[PDB]
């Protein structure tokens, strides 16, 4: 039933521009940094794995985090609290069975209390004005996959892998829209696995070309290339699993054909 696919794609393209966190927001933070943020996000990849949560749930939580940090000053000791609160909210929103607060308190090695996680939950909701239905890189990828020539699960897993890596690094990824990061991930993954490129059917749909995706693609290819040396490794480990066809183990191409 592809009756609403186009309406939905258009709606998401409209909403992503709204639910977009301030690109240079980290400069405004008196204490936290992009490196502390990378540390937080990496731990959330682990938490998502521990409780077998959906990848969408992880993407949503990062969106909430960045939007909250885009307006609220947070000292390093409360950062994991914002992360835990955001994951709880994303689980409630996205999961059939979201982990209970006690499970989230536990997973922080009991750093904060249940009441604290709930007050933070109260704070994030207030700051985000309950606007939790945010578009994600994951939501766009899911739409682009429907254009494979033919369907390839290794391509899908590698694309999802690339999209997740984008979450870890505020610089440079905060500067691209979810739909753009998803375009770059789909092409890089497809190219890596099959040698094929961004389908023209997807140009008709998104209005994006390799030329418009290029800047994101250059960044992403470098991230893909340097991935084994990154301080954060929870995503690479996650994607070594046969569930994802061990795609993090694949070798990125040396150059692209742009």
């Amino acid at each position: 039933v592809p009756d609403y696919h186009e309406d939905i794609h258009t709606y998401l393209r409209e909403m992503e521009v709204k639910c977009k966190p301030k690109v240079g927001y980290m400069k405004k933070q008196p204490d936290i940094t992009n490196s502390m943020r990378a540390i937080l996000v990496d731990w959330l990849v682990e938490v998502g794995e521990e409780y077998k949560l959906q990848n969408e749930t992880l993407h949503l939580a990062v969106n909430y985090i960045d939007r909250f940090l885009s307006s609220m000053s947070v000292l390093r000791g409360k950062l994991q609290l914002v992360g835990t609160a955001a994951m709880l909210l994303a689980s409630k929103f996205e999961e059939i069975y979201p982990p209970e607060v006690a499970e989230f308190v536990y997973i922080t090695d009991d750093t904060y209390t249940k009441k604290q996680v709930l007050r933070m939950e109260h704070l994030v909701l207030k700051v985000l004005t309950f606007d939790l239905a945010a578009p994600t890189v994951n939501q766009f990828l899911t739409q682009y996959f429907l254009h494979q020539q033919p369907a390839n699960c290794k391509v899908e897993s590698l694309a999802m892998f690339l999209g997740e890596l984008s979450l870890i690094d505020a610089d440079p990824y905060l500067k691209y829209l979810p739909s753009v990061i998803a375009g770059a991930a789909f092409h890089l993954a497809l190219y890596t696995v099959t040698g094929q490129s961004w389908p023209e059917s997807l140009i008709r749909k998104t209005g994006y070309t390799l030329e418009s995706l290029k800047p994101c693609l250059m960044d992403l290819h470098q991230t893909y290339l340097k991935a084994p040396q990154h301080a954060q490794q929870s995503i690479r480990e996650k994607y070594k699993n046969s569930k994802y066809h061990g795609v993090s183990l694949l070798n990125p191409p040396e150059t692209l054909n742009l």
């Binding site: 502390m36 540390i39 937080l40 731990w43 682990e46 938490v47 794995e49 521990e50 390093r76 000791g77 409360k78 950062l79 994991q80 536990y106 997973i107 922080t108 090695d109 009991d110 750093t111 904060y112 209390t113 009441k115 604290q116 007050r119 933070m120 109260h122 704070l123 207030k126």
Partner: protein, 69 residues
Amino acid sequence: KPSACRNLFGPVDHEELTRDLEKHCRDMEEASQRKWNFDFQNHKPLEGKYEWQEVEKGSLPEFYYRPPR
């Protein structure tokens, strides 16, 4: 224990942490109480422009008093 079970940036001052959060959470009162002339804190109508009247549940659609699942 599992690997996901970790503290990231040290122990926290629980007393001050709870107090900082209590404060931050004390925002949702302001303009809404103003617009609807209702004191959501005390659940007491007030001012005027919105003629608040408590009606019996049988007079309006049940949706309006239906609790979450």
